[PDB]
């Protein structure tokens, strides 16, 4: 449903919104109520932030493979229009999972592909470097040009506006369609064992992709920052942390975090929808990004958050950590606490080798029953949980929520 108030009619609050309160003020009182609230949250994100999700109901996908180059061809059934875009295949030399290799679907090249393939996982990414060459589905700008927009033009009404993050997500869905439609058998991939990942602006994209294409088994957004998984309402500027347990500095003080106006600037607004430009303060959002993450909460799915302690203060890892703490309430309420994971590594604005290694051990355990070598409890905490690094905010932000049981964190 999209019968939502205009932005200028929204109440403002500094509190982190309760995921368990519906827009109309009614309460989640059962897990069945949660599934309904999750659907509402999904619609709210379309309406206020990312644009209309295009779910593939109108798309017919075919493909071709030449060496490691994959061409994805899409026809929009109602209009007859066609578009195409390119992806890159990386297969493991040895498949070790019955039913085919798991597949990491990447928003761009350069996500530690060789670590994945050495561990038996396939990787298919857009033929994009994550910077100068954007995915073929949409150029990285505010003019909305590319294979997605050739089929779904960016128009004047809100339902006609789908931002670049959703355009990039749509192409991942079409790659997955091609896999189910024959490509997975050709490549010795299990298309049900799917992961989506990407970094920075493409980490925002990966979060959106997992939230909206619920077929993808694990969502793994890296260093996604503002408009990704960071809380809009939590600032870490001027806070000091001890990162020595991770090999970092024993007294590291964060500089600036990205603020709302930076997301609304010409170089970033294309990622969002037109309605997003109406917001003036973070306190106006009828959500915060723990709720975007919670769109991936499901008994058959997993969310694996990646971020960094040092050298990327703008993407606000402490606020991503706070959002993760909020998400823990939802995953615990549904009874699947271990389906939520987080790796705050020392540094690297990237998906680095240890991220892949830990993703593989985690996914192998939950999806295949393979016992891990590592202690998976390490993915259920971070350096921000050390008492000396704790903000009192962590213990109070959820205190008004309907579900705030003791000892979640």
Residue numbers in the entry: 366 to 774
What does the paper say about this structure?
Glucuronoyl esterases (GEs) within the carbohydrate esterase family 15 (CE15) esterase family, in a range of aerobic and anaerobic fungi and bacteria, have been identified as playing an important role in breaking down LCCs by cleaving the ester bond between 4-O-methyl-d-glucuronyl in xylan and alcohol groups in lignin. GEs share an invariant Ser-His-Glu/Asp catalytic triad and employ a conserved catalytic mechanism that involves the formation of an acyl-enzyme covalent intermediate, which is subsequently cleaved through acid-base hydrolysis. Rumen GEs adopt a canonical α/β hydrolase fold: FsCE15, PrCE15, and RfCE15 adopted the canonical α/β-hydrolase fold that is seen in all of the GE structures solved to date. The fold of all three enzymes consists of a central twisted 10 stranded mixed β-sheet flanked by α-helices on either side.
RfCE15 is the C-terminal GE domain of a multi-modular enzyme from R. flavefaciens called CesA. The structure of RfCE15 was refined to Rwork/Rfree of 16.8%/19.0% using data with a maximum resolution of 1.25 Å. The catalytic residues of RfCE15 are observed in a non-canonical configuration, with the putative general acid Glu677 located on a loop at the end of β8; making RfCE15 a member of the CE15-A GE subfamily. The general base (His714) is located on a loop directly above the catalytic serine, but is shifted by 2.2 Å relative to the position of this loop in FsCE15 and PrCE15. The shift in this position accommodates the non-canonical conformation of the general acid residue. Despite the shift in Cα of His714, the imidazole ring occupies a similar location as that found in the other GEs, with His714 Nε2 making a 2.8 Å hydrogen bond with Oγ of Ser565, and a 2.9 Å bidentate hydrogen bond with the carboxyl functional group of Glu677. Most notably, a 16 amino acid insertion from residues Gly603-Tyr619 forms an extended Ω-loop that wraps around the backside of the general base loop. As observed in other CE15-A subfamily GEs, the conserved disulfide bond found in CE15-B GEs, was not observed in RfCE15. Instead, these residues are Val564 and Val715 and form a hydrophobic pocket that is composed of an extended network of Van der Waals interactions between Ile114, Ile121, Met228, Phe314, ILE316, Ile366, and Met369. In contrast, the addition of reducing agent to RfCE15 did not alter its thermal stability, an observation consistent with the lack of disulfide bonds.
